[PDB]
């Protein structure tokens, strides 16, 4: 086993993926693969020069030299576990005390794979050793109930899903499709995405849990299933890997459905143009995310000046010079005979210098542990250059307490701050694969994201407002009368359903209905009451009844001259001078019933309208049948008792029925203004009227041969044969249409006008028209 | 560091609590405590002699020597973790390859504490090393989703709670109280107990989460809160430790409430008479549980023959001889000067030989790994004495597969079988602290439990059937009429609520009600229909109507002699000979209405009863008013038309009302048998009868001065003044009580009998009684 070592006071180890992973036949022999350049030796020399800088910077840890013990991880779980066993036994022999030098391992950094770091944490919890990673992105590692000693200077995939939710939230897109690859990277990220999409109502058609190496027929079936949701969903969010997006683009070329689907993605194709290699006509318009990766000139100047004759601190730098430049440095102690060519002295290092994209994150973690130890020194050893007895030795409980509450500016100047879950906030970059002038598109920048701060250039993409259409299931309905209704599939496939004419829009998926006599406004906001009728205007239908009542009241005073002044003429002396007066008064009240009925409906006017309908034919017929019965001192008594019968009947009716003003409801849009007119109160005086008129007809048919009072009985019979038709035809016309005022003002005045013009007008025809018997 | 080592082919380590646990000032210096005799060196020598026996037994692993590497655990988590780091680096240097001997650690046994084994498993999962414990009882360790490489030859606390549920289930106890101490032993066991008690409806008053070192005032408050549930709950189940039970007994002595509470417990006071030390008057009757602990003579014979001059294999046996017998063996290499006295040569070892109670479980785990390796040898190296290339090397995946499906007989002969959770089933012992003849009680055996097999001696405890009363909230209710009802607190505090007289017991907490005309049986099982009345017996109330109808039918033929035979006498020649015949026929039908009404209600009999009630006074009165009107060829026509009027009326009634047989419901317990008798069908013939009788009375009052037919009109008027009272008083008596058959059979026959005896009997009084005008 090899180790790169730095001496010092506090030694902080690391696990870097120097070699490639071993195969299935090397899991027991631990034969690691070839040396990985970017993830490996670059991070090693970066940590070496970073601790050389931190030992040379007296701002933090002034009289404390921070050494290191760099051991390989080989990208595999078991080898990293073996080197962590080496770390912990070095810590234990330092605690207890050939190679008697002690080295208490305090912290350790790495490795890259989250599937390996999740194994390393289960070893490091037991030993009070905190560990800060730089490439683990799995969100289950945030659970410090299980993973207490795991901290990250990188954001999780949950904050990738957060930004993927936020960019859709900014673009007002609701019914979208989203796929994800199999594994802990895809599944957890899609779970966080669908958990945060429900906070904005963003619908998901169907998640397609595809595999990392699915077949071309399987990818074509997934593309057909995605097209089955089109055109209702256009944006496809793939929290997935780069080979997933490459297989989807292979399916888009093999299906020929390019230029339609919008492909949102995670950092699997962040700068990976090899995913869109040769697929630039199909990949256009896609939006991905990427961590901010600034290039640090510190490691550049510290790394381009390295030579194998100088860099003897790294025990595999000479092997890296041997294998990576494919030459045989025979003077080097790592002189391998596998390379046939020799190493020239002018063989430079600046050729193809492409450093790690995650280079700044390693230095961020190193400075995180550095300022954590500086906070420990400032908290426990106040005003001291080195370390006092409170830091002799150092366990990880108060070290975790110090690292949890740290804050500084990194190599990018980023304010590195740790939450309660021990995670740095996300600071991403947003790009587009927009087409250039020629047929060569690139991942061009369209802005960035930082913890909610979503700086975007909407004018950059589509070059206008003519974007991809809003991926939504239901359009917004016509909110004046039509309302939405859920079908039962998603929260955005609403159905534009109109509501009733008496139902206003109250809820977003329901209409409340107005009550009887109420109907909504023009915006379906509330309700409005329909107005009622005053029933007194120049309306041509009741004005005939008004003119007819005026003619009756004029004819009353026309008749009233030739017997009140002529009260001594023997034509009227033999006639009944009180009974005909009572009959004329009843006819006058029957004329006044027209004015009492066609008026304003009030608490007194309805009672004054309803008191006369029973009485005015009754007192007109009572004196008539009283005079008819005698065909010697009860002449004003029998008719008075017959009037008092109907008086008692109408008083007993009005005791049971108080005067009320109701509203007739012929429909939902018409509200009238009626009185307290019940069927009992209609029929009960009609029964007494029918009892009077049949007895009067039976008496007139018997006494129709009385010539007295200048043919009085003939005129009586001629009046009664007309009234027996009128008071019989009154019933169906009143019980038919809604003319309960109009027919009432017509027919009662008509009956009184007949009882005038066929009884009293022929009685004065031999008086006024014939002045011989005035 | 020290280690006890056995050479061999397959080396299986162990972690035994040899020393006592270090203090708070020795967690960094690892200064372990004094040597623990029972849990420590006894288990060490047991494993040494057990592997010596297994190497000498050619039944399993014939040409394989099973060595060991015994390292201390010191009862503390960190020291056991350090020695496990030593184990895994020994495994790694054996995998890779001064002291160049390799030793691949395959399995490891222990330690005792579950709180330490839960730390050791998080280290051993990462390395494919299975581990079998012998004292860990925590039930969260059964979760092999998290704890895949942890197996037990001991049952969990869940199977303690299972037996504590089962003994209560056998004793039919429902509303009990249960307390538990704080910690993972008490809390998980109480959670499993309350989870399994809900499978039997066993109520729990309130769990009292007390602490291990609660105050005496706190224990008195807990005792008062437990007495607050008394006497409704008597048995107290304490899945707790021994100091908990000792504190509860201190509270019982300080409160003086002894001799009442039943104390069920776990193995915290299994053989711990120090809990009940001096508390034997208060602790009587309590039931605890204990694992079966047989004494193995193998370790006895292998351990009593040990000497420090011989046992040089154990590197701390000489220190155990130094400290445990408090003498200074100066010739021994562990000659400590702390002991002033010297070691005699006759100083024996058999004095106070009290071995471990869990001694057999260690040997069970050793034989479990032995037969697992034997199953591996039989599965991978068939017919081979040693090990083939399939067992070179050996990881723990297929070793776990072999250990999961093992079965053998242990040192006690117990069939050790592992479930899907990797746990041995429980095989307990049940004891009681029953009083002896003197005042010295002991933990006497009352049976055992083995995976459901609950062998108990009920005659042993209480010496009779007079036991502790069943701890229940509600007694079983009187199930004849009274039903239970839940109050809303527990599933056993039911309230004995009676139900209605028409409601039968259907549910255990609800009564279903019978319908109208139905009422339950004597056991409230279903419903029963009430019988109806036939209304024809020797009942004294309708038999008067029957005798009266017979007298009427006799008087009909009494009258029918003196005018049918005497059809030429001029007394009856001037009288109406057809009209009086029609009247007599109507009286005969009115007499027949009594027989038609008081009969069996059928579809024809109800119609025949209801056809005559309208017709029989109508045809009797029609000829009467027809003869009365003439006071010349329509004499049989006018009365016929008046009969046909009522005929048409009753046909129009029976068209609207078909003949139906209904059931009168005067109450919920009485169902009668009536016909289709509606109020319309009652009033409508009564109106025609009233129209007839008033016209007949008005005609008789005018024609009461007609002396013809030997004073006929006087008898007519005298009949009519009686019928005007009868047919007017018929209405309230019929509209009052439930005599709709009785009054109908009375009054119609009474009216016909009056119309006979005041009209025709005086008409024949001058015929039969006076034979001069026969
Ligand atoms: C919703 O997002 C679209 C994105 O193109 C934008 O044009 C529109 O103005 C947004 N709606 C509102 C109300 O801002
Ligand atoms: C880190 O953040 C906290 C709160 O956000 C602030 O009080 C502190 O000053 C910051 N650290 C530095 C070095 O500014
Ligand atoms: C428990 O209940 C069963 C059910 O009837 C009964 O047979 C048994 O005798 C009961 N046991 C005791 C101890 O009451
Ligand atoms: C162990 O149990 C299984 C099933 O219960 C049985 O088939 C097997 O024979 C048993 N082992 C022995 C040694 O009897």
PDB file of C-alpha atoms and ligand atoms in Angstrom, chain A residues 170-172 467, ligand 1:
ATOM      1  CA  UNK A 170     -41.502  30.805 -13.680  1.00  0.00           C
ATOM      2  CA  UNK A 171     -42.718  29.667 -17.113  1.00  0.00           C
ATOM      3  CA  UNK A 172     -46.303  28.906 -15.908  1.00  0.00           C
ATOM      4  CA  UNK A 467     -42.127  30.069 -27.106  1.00  0.00           C
TER       5      UNK A 467
HETATM    6  C1  LIG C   1     -46.825  32.899 -17.360  1.00  0.00           C
HETATM    7  O1  LIG C   1     -45.610  32.477 -18.020  1.00  0.00           O
HETATM    8  C2  LIG C   1     -45.508  32.884 -19.394  1.00  0.00           C
HETATM    9  C3  LIG C   1     -44.227  32.290 -19.932  1.00  0.00           C
HETATM   10  O2  LIG C   1     -44.053  32.598 -21.308  1.00  0.00           O
HETATM   11  C4  LIG C   1     -45.545  34.408 -19.486  1.00  0.00           C
HETATM   12  O3  LIG C   1     -45.507  34.802 -20.851  1.00  0.00           O
HETATM   13  C5  LIG C   1     -46.809  34.941 -18.823  1.00  0.00           C
HETATM   14  O4  LIG C   1     -46.781  36.364 -18.807  1.00  0.00           O
HETATM   15  C6  LIG C   1     -46.922  34.428 -17.390  1.00  0.00           C
HETATM   16  N1  LIG C   1     -48.156  34.891 -16.773  1.00  0.00           N
HETATM   17  C7  LIG C   1     -48.207  35.935 -15.939  1.00  0.00           C
HETATM   18  C8  LIG C   1     -49.562  36.275 -15.396  1.00  0.00           C
HETATM   19  O5  LIG C   1     -47.205  36.575 -15.638  1.00  0.00           O
END
